[PDB]
Amino acid sequence: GHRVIVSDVQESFIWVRYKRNENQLIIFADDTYPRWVTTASLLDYDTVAGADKFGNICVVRLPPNTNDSQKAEVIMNYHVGETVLSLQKT
Amino acid sequence: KFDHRFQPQNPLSGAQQFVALCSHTMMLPTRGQLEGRMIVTAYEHGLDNVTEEAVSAVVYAVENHLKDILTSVVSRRKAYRLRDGHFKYAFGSNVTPQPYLKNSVVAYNNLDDAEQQAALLLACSGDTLPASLPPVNMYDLFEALQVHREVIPTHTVYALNIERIITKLWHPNHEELQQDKVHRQRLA
Amino acid sequence: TKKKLQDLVREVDPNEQLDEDVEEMLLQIADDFIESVVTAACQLARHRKSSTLEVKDVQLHLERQWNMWIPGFG
Amino acid sequence: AVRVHVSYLSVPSAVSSLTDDLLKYYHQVTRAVLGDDPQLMKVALQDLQTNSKIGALLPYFVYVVSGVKSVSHDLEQLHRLLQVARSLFRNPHLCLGPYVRCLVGSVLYCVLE
Amino acid sequence: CHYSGHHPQPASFCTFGSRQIGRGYYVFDSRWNRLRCALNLMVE
Amino acid sequence: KRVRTEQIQMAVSCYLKRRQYVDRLSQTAEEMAANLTVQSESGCANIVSAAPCQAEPQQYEVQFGRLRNFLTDSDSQHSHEVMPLLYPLFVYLHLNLVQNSPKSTVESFYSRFHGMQKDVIEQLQTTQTIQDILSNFKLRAFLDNKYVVRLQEDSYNYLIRYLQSDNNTALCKVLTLHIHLDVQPNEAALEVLQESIKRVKPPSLTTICFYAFYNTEQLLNTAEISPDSKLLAAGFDNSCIKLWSLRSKKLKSEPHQVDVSRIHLACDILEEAGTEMKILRGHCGPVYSTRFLADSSGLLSCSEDMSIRYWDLGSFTNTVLYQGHAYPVWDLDISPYSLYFASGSHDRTARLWSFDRTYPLRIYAGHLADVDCVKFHPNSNYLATGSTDKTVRLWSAQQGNSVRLFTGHRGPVLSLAFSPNGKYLASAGEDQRLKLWDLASGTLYKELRGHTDNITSLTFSPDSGLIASASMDNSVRVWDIRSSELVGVYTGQMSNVLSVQFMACNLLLVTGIT
C-alpha cells in the first residue's frame, strides 16, 4: 500500500514508490550485494525476504530514515545448501 | 542634484507634412521612371520648370555609388595590384608574387615573348588547385561596411540600412546538415 | 530590359556572383541614395532665393560631402 | 597576484553561547532527543535539517567527541549518533569545508575495532 | 556656454527621414504614397 | 499646463471603452498551457495571404505525380512515417477539384491515379458537385476537420526539404489549411515552539570570504567566480582576460593546431608546464562583462568591439565569434541550466541569442536609452531590461513582448536580480535606493535607503530571505527580506567591491581591489 518492491534478476532488491498526484516511479534505495533473486516474500511492512538460484536466503532490514545514499544493510544471511524457490510465513 | 542633468532632444518631433518605388521591380531607375518621382517630391517644396540635366546627374551619381559599393565588397575577398598609387585595375588572378622568394625579388627588381611573361605572373606563386570563394552572402557585405565606413558618409542612409542587414543574417544549423548528408548518400 | 544588376557587376569584375537577397538591399541602398540627394538638392533649391530651380551647378556644390565629382558640364 | 584571506564579523563573540536562545535548546537535544525515547527522531531530525543556524561550532563537536571517544563500548547510542550525523551531511546549508580534520578522525575511530 | 533651467534646443538635429501621417504614424519617406491617396480620397 | 494623475486615469478608461475592454493574474500553468493551445491555432495564417492565386489548369497531377516518384524510391528508413501521408492528400486535392469544379480535369486526376478505405474513394467517384458534398453529411464534416499526423522531427525535416522545390506551392496550400502536423522531439509542545522560533532568524550567517587583487595598474572591469569554485576569471581594460586556479590543480593546456591570436605568416610549418597564470588575448578593446556556463565548460565575455567571442575550456582559445549588434555591448549574462543568453547594446535594445547560431533570434525594442542591465528569470522564460531612462521593463523569452513597465527611479538603474522563488524582483541604481517590485501586483512595497553611493550588483540568498547590495562607498550591507532590516554592515578596508554572489551554505564572496 505504500511502496513497490522490485526483485531484480541481477540486483538484490529495488524499492520504488509510486505517487498518486505526481504519478512517477521514484527509485531511492538499492542493495550492495548482487543476488540472483528467484522469488520474494513479505513478512511485514519493513522486512522483505528473497531467495537465490543456489539456496541463499536473506532478510533485509531498512533503516527508519529512508526517502519514502540508502544502501541496504543485511542482518541475517544463510545458505541452505539446496535450491530454494519459495518463501512463505504462516 | 539629478535635475541638472539634461535630456537628449528627440529628433522625432521635427517632421515634415504630407499632402497629396523602384524596389520590387529589380530595375535600376531609368530616365522615365525617375521623372515621376522628382516632380512629385518637388511639389511639396514648390519647384517649377523641371529640367533634364539634373535627372541625368542623379542617375550617374547612383551608378557611381553602386560601383563603389561593389568595388569595396570585392576588394575584401579578392586580390589586386596598385599602379602609381591608389589605382585598382587588376581585380583578377594571382599575378602578385610571394615576397619571401628570392626569385620574386629579382623579378620585382627587373620591373612568343608575350606568353612567357604571362607565365612569369600566373605561375610563379600560388597553389596547385586555387579554390574560389563562395558567392557574396549577407555576412561579407556587413563586414565590408564596418571596416571602410567611407562609402556612405550620411548617417541617415548608413544607419537605417545596417540594422536591416543584421536581420538578414542566416546560416544552416545542425539539423539541415543531415539532410545534405542523406541526399549525398542517395545519389552515390 | 537593360542594365538591371548583372551588367554593372561585369562592369567591374567579370567573375563575381551576388546572392538573391543581396540584390534587393543594393536597390534599397540606391533608393535611399536617390531620396537623400533630391531632398538635399531641393533644400538648396529653396535656398537660392527662397526658391529658384533644380540646378546642376548647385548639385556640384552638394557633392563635396560625398567626395565625388560628376564628369558632366558644370 | 591573488591571495585568499577569510575575515570574521579568535572567538569573535560567537563561540560562547550567550544569545539567550541556545542553552535551552541545547538541553532539550542532549537529554530528550538521544537515547531511550522513541517516536521523536523523525520530527526533530527534519526540523534540524531545514534550519542551518551555523556559527556556534561548539555542540556538534561535543556529541561526536563524547559519543565516539566515550560511548565506543556501548550500544543503542552510537547507531543514532551516526543517523543524526548523516542527516547533517545531507543539509545543503552547513559549511563543513574547513572542518574536515576535526570530524573524520573520529569517524576513523568508529570503524577502528 | 550658458547656464539656465531650460534645455538648450539646437533646432538643427539630424532630421531622420520621417513624415507625420495620422499624427501617430510615421513613414520612412516612401512606400506609403499611392495607398494614402487611395484611402483618403475614397474613405473621406 | 500641468498634467495631473486623475485625468490620465480617465484617458486610459476612455481608451478601454473605445476598444471595448469592459470585460486575471494566476500562477497555475495548466490553464496557461490550455490557453496557449487555444491561441496557437486560432486563425493561423502564414501563406494564406501568399496563396497560389493562379489559374494553373495542369498543376495538381504533375505535382502529385512527382510525390510518388521521389517518396517511394531509394528510401526505407524515413518512409514509414510519411507513406501514410500520401493517402489523404489525394482525397483533399479531390475536394479542391470539387471546389473549382472543372469538367475533365477532375475526372482525369481520379481516373489516372485511382490506385492511391474503399468506401471513401467510391463516395468521391459518385460525387462531383459541392452541393452533394454538403448533402452527404459526412464529407461536409471532412472538409471542416483536419487530419492530424504524429510524425517525428526527422520525417518533417524530410518533408520540409521536398516542399521547397519547384512547383510545390499548390501542395503547400493543403498543408497550411487541411493538415495539422505534430512534432515530437506526549504533548510535544517544545517541538512546536522551536518550529516557530528557529524558523525566524540576526542570522549571523555571513561567512565572508574575500578575494584580493594586489598592486597593479589602475584598471579592472569585472571578476566572476565559477559556481563550482574551480576557476576565477577577470577582465582587464587592455583586452586581457586572466584565469586563476582556486583549488591548486595546475591545469594543463591541450594542443589545438589552430590559433587565432597568432599571425602564422607563410614561412611557417605546422608542427603538431606551468599554471596559476594564463592570459586570454582575443578582444580588441575593453571587456565589459564576463560570465560562465554554470558548468565550468566555457566562458562568455562581451567586449567594446561590437562582438561576443565565446571562450573554450578544452582548447583554451577563442572558438566562436558573434558579430551581432555592431554596436558597443554593455552587459552580458547567461540563462540558468545553460540554455540561451542575451546582451544589451547602444541601440536602445537587447537581443536574445542561442548556442547554435551566430545571429540574434529575438529583438526587444521600446527603450529610450542604452540598456545597461539585463537578467534571466530562474525558469528561463522572462527577461528584465534596465536603462538610464528611469524605467525597468519585463520581457518574454518566447514571444518577445513587454508585459510590465516599472517606473519610479530618480535616475539610471545599475543592478538587477531575480529572486530564487521567482516571485520578487529587485532594482537599484544611482538614486541610492534599493527597490523591490512584485511580479504580480506591479507596485512597490518597500523603500530601502542604506547606501549613500552607487549600487553595483545585487544577489539573492538561496533561501530568498537575505540579499547583499555591493556599493562603491566600501560597504557591503546584507539585509533581511523575510534601514532597520540589516543583518551586518561590513567595513570597507579596500578601494571598492566588485561582485557578491551566493551559491550555497550562505557563503559570502566579496571581490575587491587593494
From Swiss-Prot, chain A:
**What's the protein name?**
Splicing factor 3B subunit 3
Protein location: Nucleus
Q: What does the domain comment read?
A: The core of the protein consists of three beta-propeller domains.
Q: Where is this region: Interaction with SF3B1?
A: 32-53
Provide the assembly information: Component of the 17S U2 SnRNP complex, a ribonucleoprotein complex that contains small nuclear RNA (snRNA) U2 and a number of specific proteins. Part of the SF3B subcomplex of the 17S U2 SnRNP complex. SF3B associates with the splicing subcomplex SF3A and a 12S RNA unit to form the U2 small nuclear ribonucleoproteins complex (U2 snRNP). Within the SF3B subcomplex, interacts directly with SF3B1 (via HEAT domain), SF3B5 and PHF5A. Identified in the spliceosome A complex; remains associated with the spliceosome throughout the splicing process. Component of the spliceosome B complex.
Family per UniProt? Belongs to the RSE1 family.
Gene it is expressed from: SF3B3
Q: What organism, scientifically named, is this protein from?
A: Homo sapiens
Q: What does this protein do?
A: Component of the 17S U2 SnRNP complex of the spliceosome, a large ribonucleoprotein complex that removes introns from transcribed pre-mRNAs. The 17S U2 SnRNP complex (1) directly participates in early spliceosome assembly and (2) mediates recognition of the intron branch site during pre-mRNA splicing by promoting the selection of the pre-mRNA branch-site adenosine, the nucleophile for the first step of splicing.
UniProtKB/Swiss-Prot annotation, chain B:
Query: Which molecular function GO terms apply here?
Result: transcription coactivator activity
Keywords per UniProt:
Nucleus, Transcription, Transcription regulation
What's an example Gene Ontology biological process for this entry? regulation of RNA splicing
Q: Which GO terms describe its cellular component?
A: cytosol; focal adhesion; nucleoplasm; nucleus; SAGA complex
Location relative to the cell? Nucleus
Record family assignment: Belongs to the TADA1 family.
Quaternary state and interactors: Component of the STAGA transcription coactivator-HAT complex, at least composed of SUPT3H, GCN5L2, TAF5L, TAF6L, SUPT7L, TADA3L, TAD1L, TAF10, TAF12, TRRAP and TAF9.
- Described function: Probably involved in transcriptional regulation.
Q: What is this protein called?
A: Transcriptional adapter 1
Gene designation per UniProt: TADA1
Full protein stretch here: 108 to 327 of 335
From Swiss-Prot, chain D:
**Where in the cell is the protein located?**
Nucleus
* Protein origin, superkingdom: Eukaryota
Q: Subunit comment for this entry?
A: The PCAF complex is composed of a number of TBP-associated factors (TAFS), such as TAF5, TAF5L, TAF6, TAF6L, TAF9, TAF10 and TAF12, PCAF, and also PCAF-associated factors (PAFs), such as TADA2L/ADA2, TADA3L/ADA3 and SPT3. Component of the STAGA transcription coactivator-HAT complex, at least composed of SUPT3H, GCN5L2, TAF5L, TAF6L, SUPT7L, TADA3L, TAD1L, TAF10, TAF12, TRRAP and TAF9.
Q: Outline what the protein does.
A: Functions as a component of the PCAF complex. The PCAF complex is capable of efficiently acetylating histones in a nucleosomal context. The PCAF complex could be considered as the human version of the yeast SAGA complex. With TAF5L, acts as an epigenetic regulator essential for somatic reprogramming. Regulates target genes through H3K9ac deposition and MYC recruitment which trigger MYC regulatory network to orchestrate gene expression programs to control embryonic stem cell state. Functions with MYC to activate target gene expression through RNA polymerase II pause release.
State the family named in the UniProt similarity comment for this chain.
Belongs to the TAF6 family.
Task: Write the protein's name.
Answer: TAF6-like RNA polymerase II p300/CBP-associated factor-associated factor 65 kDa subunit 6L
Which lineage ranks, top first, belong to the organism behind this chain? Eukaryota, Metazoa, Chordata, Craniata, Vertebrata
Q: Which residues of the full protein are shown?
A: 126 to 248 of 622
UniProtKB/Swiss-Prot annotation, chain F:
Q: Where are the WD repeats?
A: 215-254, 282-321, 324-363, 366-405, 408-447, 450-482
Tell me which GO cellular component terms the UniProt record holds.
cytoplasmic ribonucleoprotein granule; nuclear speck; nucleus; SAGA complex; transcription factor TFTC complex
User: SMART domains of this UniProt entry?
Assistant: WD40
Task: Report which superkingdom the organism of origin falls in.
Answer: Eukaryota
What CDD domains does the entry give? TAF5_NTD2, WD40
Picking any one GO molecular function of the record gives:
transcription coactivator activity
Query: Which processes are annotated in GO (biological process)?
Result: positive regulation of DNA-templated transcription; regulation of DNA repair; regulation of DNA-templated transcription; regulation of RNA splicing; regulation of somatic stem cell population maintenance; regulation of transcription by RNA polymerase II; transcription by RNA polymerase II
Question: What UniProt keywords apply to this chain's record, in alphabetical order?
Answer: Nucleus, Repeat, Transcription, Transcription regulation, WD repeat
Return any one Pfam family short name. Answer: TFIID_NTD2
**So where does this one cross the membrane?**
none
Q: Which InterPro entries match?
A: G-protein_beta_WD-40_rep, TFIID_NTD2, TFIID_NTD2_sf, WD40/YVTN_repeat-like_dom_sf, WD40_repeat_CS, WD40_repeat_dom_sf, WD40_rpt
Subcellular localization, as worded in the UniProt entry: Nucleus
Answer yes or no on keyword Methyltransferase: no
Q: How does it assemble?
A: The PCAF complex is composed of a number of TBP-associated factors (TAFS), such as TAF5, TAF5L, TAF6, TAF6L, TAF9, TAF10 and TAF12, PCAF, and also PCAF-associated factors (PAFs), such as TADA2L/ADA2, TADA3L/ADA3 and SPT3. Component of the STAGA transcription coactivator-HAT complex, at least composed of SUPT3H, GCN5L2, TAF5L, TAF6L, SUPT7L, TADA3L, TAD1L, TAF10, TAF12, TRRAP and TAF9.
Its family remark reads: Belongs to the WD repeat TAF5 family.
- Protein name (Swiss-Prot/TrEMBL): TAF5-like RNA polymerase II p300/CBP-associated factor-associated factor 65 kDa subunit 5L
